[PDB]
Design an enzyme around this catalytic site. Structure first.
Site, short mmCIF file in Angstrom:
data_model
loop_
_atom_site.label_atom_id
_atom_site.label_comp_id
_atom_site.label_asym_id
_atom_site.label_seq_id
_atom_site.Cartn_x
_atom_site.Cartn_y
_atom_site.Cartn_z
N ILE A 189 0.81 -1.21 0.00
CA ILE A 189 0.00 0.00 0.00
C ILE A 189 0.85 1.27 0.00
O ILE A 189 0.32 2.38 -0.02
CB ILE A 189 -0.96 0.03 1.20
CG1 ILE A 189 -0.17 0.06 2.52
CG2 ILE A 189 -1.91 -1.16 1.16
CD1 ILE A 189 -1.05 0.08 3.75
N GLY A 190 2.17 1.11 0.02
CA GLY A 190 3.07 2.24 0.02
C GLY A 190 4.50 1.80 -0.24
O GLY A 190 4.91 0.73 0.20
N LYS A 248 8.88 0.70 3.09
CA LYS A 248 7.83 0.01 2.34
C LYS A 248 6.69 -0.34 3.29
O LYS A 248 6.91 -0.77 4.42
CB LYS A 248 8.40 -1.25 1.70
CG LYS A 248 7.40 -2.06 0.89
CD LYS A 248 8.07 -3.33 0.35
CE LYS A 248 7.13 -4.18 -0.49
NZ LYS A 248 7.81 -5.41 -0.97
N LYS A 289 4.86 -1.14 8.37
CA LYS A 289 5.95 -0.35 7.82
C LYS A 289 7.29 -1.07 7.97
O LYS A 289 7.75 -1.31 9.09
CB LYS A 289 6.02 1.02 8.51
CG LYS A 289 7.21 1.87 8.09
CD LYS A 289 7.24 3.20 8.83
CE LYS A 289 8.54 3.94 8.56
NZ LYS A 289 8.59 5.26 9.24
N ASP A 336 7.55 16.65 7.95
CA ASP A 336 7.20 16.03 6.68
C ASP A 336 5.70 16.04 6.41
O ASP A 336 5.13 15.06 5.93
CB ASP A 336 7.77 14.61 6.56
CG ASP A 336 7.77 14.10 5.13
OD1 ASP A 336 7.72 14.94 4.20
OD2 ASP A 336 7.82 12.87 4.92
N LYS A 345 2.69 16.67 4.31
CA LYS A 345 2.35 16.78 2.90
C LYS A 345 1.07 15.99 2.63
O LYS A 345 0.67 15.15 3.44
CB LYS A 345 3.49 16.27 2.02
CG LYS A 345 3.95 14.86 2.34
CD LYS A 345 5.07 14.43 1.42
CE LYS A 345 5.69 13.13 1.87
NZ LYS A 345 6.77 12.69 0.94
N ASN A 391 0.75 12.30 3.36
CA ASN A 391 1.01 11.95 4.76
C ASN A 391 -0.19 12.31 5.62
O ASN A 391 -0.17 12.11 6.84
CB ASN A 391 2.27 12.64 5.29
CG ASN A 391 3.51 11.79 5.10
OD1 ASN A 391 3.48 10.76 4.43
ND2 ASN A 391 4.62 12.24 5.68
N1 LIG Z 1 0.15 7.48 1.38
C1 LIG Z 1 -0.67 6.30 1.68
C2 LIG Z 1 0.17 5.00 1.43
N2 LIG Z 1 1.45 5.06 2.11
C3 LIG Z 1 1.54 4.94 3.44
N3 LIG Z 1 0.42 4.70 4.14
C4 LIG Z 1 0.47 4.61 5.48
C5 LIG Z 1 -0.77 4.22 6.18
C6 LIG Z 1 -0.82 4.08 7.56
C7 LIG Z 1 -1.99 3.68 8.16
N4 LIG Z 1 -3.11 3.41 7.49
C8 LIG Z 1 -3.07 3.54 6.16
C9 LIG Z 1 -1.94 3.94 5.47
N5 LIG Z 1 1.57 4.78 6.23
C10 LIG Z 1 2.68 5.01 5.53
S1 LIG Z 1 4.21 5.23 6.32
C11 LIG Z 1 5.00 5.41 4.78
C12 LIG Z 1 4.16 5.31 3.72
C13 LIG Z 1 2.78 5.09 4.14
C14 LIG Z 1 4.67 5.39 2.31
C15 LIG Z 1 6.05 6.01 2.27
C16 LIG Z 1 6.99 5.42 3.30
C17 LIG Z 1 6.48 5.66 4.71
C18 LIG Z 1 -1.95 6.21 0.81
C19 LIG Z 1 -2.81 5.04 1.21
C20 LIG Z 1 -3.84 5.20 2.13
C21 LIG Z 1 -4.63 4.12 2.50
C22 LIG Z 1 -4.40 2.88 1.95
C23 LIG Z 1 -3.39 2.71 1.04
C24 LIG Z 1 -2.60 3.79 0.67
#
Ligand SMILES: N[C@H](CNc1nc(-c2ccncc2)nc2sc3c(c12)CCCC3)Cc1ccccc1
Ligand SMILES: [Cl-]
EC number: 2.7.11.13
Length: 320
Positions: A13-14, A20, A36, A131, A133, A136
């Site tokens: 998801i990221g 990752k 994470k 950070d 944005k 985030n």
């Molecule tokens: N920008 C969201 C996907 N990326 C991330 N989502 C979440 C997160 C935490 C808790 N519930 C959901 C997501 N935490 C993180 S920490 C992190 C990233 C990321 C990516 C870069 C490296 C560090 C977009 C997104 C939202 C919802 C589902 C999928 C993607």
């Protein structure tokens, strides 16, 4: 304690360079979480020596706040660190702006309010987010925001304290960082200013028509002008959060900083208390609407410095 065995790696998801994020399911509980993952070798080489310590400390403070993702648990393999985190299922502001292109002032006012409460709380706890944005800024099923990815946080900042690390996401990086000056919480409020601008204008204040060196030039030299279609209230907060002088920037007054925000005409008619208890209804409900691990490098892992990761394991006695 916990480990990969206790989980089902559902999906990705990221994905950044350093980190990752996977969607996972705790087997014995059937509950869904976000995970994470970071290579511990990069944690030693790229991050401050207290990175692991700062992360754990930040998740602690985040479990006691509505607009901050909390930590369920964390563990380590030989090469990686694993952060099992409260899952948020509403997407993020970037995804929203992608379909919306532009938000009404009321919507931006709502979001910027919640974002402020989450930030002021971190600042109060001697932490700089560093950070903020669109992507985030997560949204829950109800429609409230939640700040995630604490990988850039600075910790233990006492009154008058100042750090000096050059970091962030270029588009949101403050001028005082670009000048190489010691800075404090001011960077977060500048970031919110930039974010608020994107929300109400539909574009970054630094959009165009050495590519990053040019961006940094725009931010430092080019005059920031608010579009004529925005209200006098909106024009003000933007220009105030976007004041290149940290000393004179809105929300940066050592004493009345956060009071100056709540008092700002733009935020007039905002019930902060109700806002903070989620007693204010969101202008958009992500629900009912809208629309595997890389193999280790044995020659690297064998020589990793595990020092900083000793006693990394953890579980939160109170479900965040
Ligand atoms: N920008 C969201 C996907 N990326 C991330 N989502 C979440 C997160 C935490 C808790 N519930 C959901 C997501 N935490 C993180 S920490 C992190 C990233 C990321 C990516 C870069 C490296 C560090 C977009 C997104 C939202 C919802 C589902 C999928 C993607
Ligand atoms: Cl200016």
């Amino acid at each position: 304690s916990l480990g990969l065995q206790d989980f089902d790696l559902l999906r990705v998801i990221g994905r950044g360079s350093y980190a990752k994020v996977l969607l996972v399911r705790l087997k014995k509980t059937d509950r869904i979480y976000a995970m994470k993952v970071v290579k511990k070798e990069l944690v030693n080489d790229d991050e401050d020596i207290d990175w692991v310590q700062t992360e754990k400390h930040v998740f602690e403070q985040a479990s006691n706040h509505p607009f901050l993702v909390g930590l369920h648990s964390c563990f380590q393999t030989e090469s990686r660190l694993f952060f099992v985190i409260e899952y948020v299922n509403g997407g993020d502001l970037m995804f929203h702006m992608q379909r919306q292109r532009k938000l009404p002032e009321e919507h931006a006012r709502f979001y910027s309010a919640e974002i402020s409460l989450a930030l002021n709380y971190l600042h109060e706890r001697g932490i700089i987010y560093r950070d903020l944005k669109l992507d985030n800024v997560l949204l829950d099923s109800e429609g409230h925001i939640k700040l995630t990815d604490y990988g850039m946080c600075k910790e233990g900042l006492r009154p008058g304290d100042t750090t000096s690390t050059f970091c962030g996401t270029p588009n949101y990086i403050a001028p005082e960082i670009l000048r190489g000056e010691d800075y404090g919480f001011s960077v977060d409020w500048w970031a919110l200013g930039v974010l608020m601008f994107e929300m109400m204008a539909g574009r970054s204040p630094f959009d165009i028509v050495n590519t990053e060196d040019y961006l940094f030039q725009v931010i430092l030299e080019k005059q920031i002008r608010i579009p004529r279609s925005l209200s006098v209230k909106a024009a003000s907060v933007l220009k105030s959060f976007l004041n290149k002088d940290p000393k004179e920037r809105l929300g940066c007054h050592p004493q009345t900083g956060f009071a100056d925000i709540q008092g700002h005409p733009f935020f007039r008619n905002v019930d902060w208390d109700m806002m903070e208890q989620k007693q204010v209804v969101p202008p958009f409900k992500p629900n009912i609407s809208g629309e595997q691990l890389t193999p280790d490098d044995d020659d690297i892992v064998r020589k990793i410095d595990q020092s900083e990761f000793e006693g990394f394991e953890y579980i939160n006695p109170l479900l965040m």
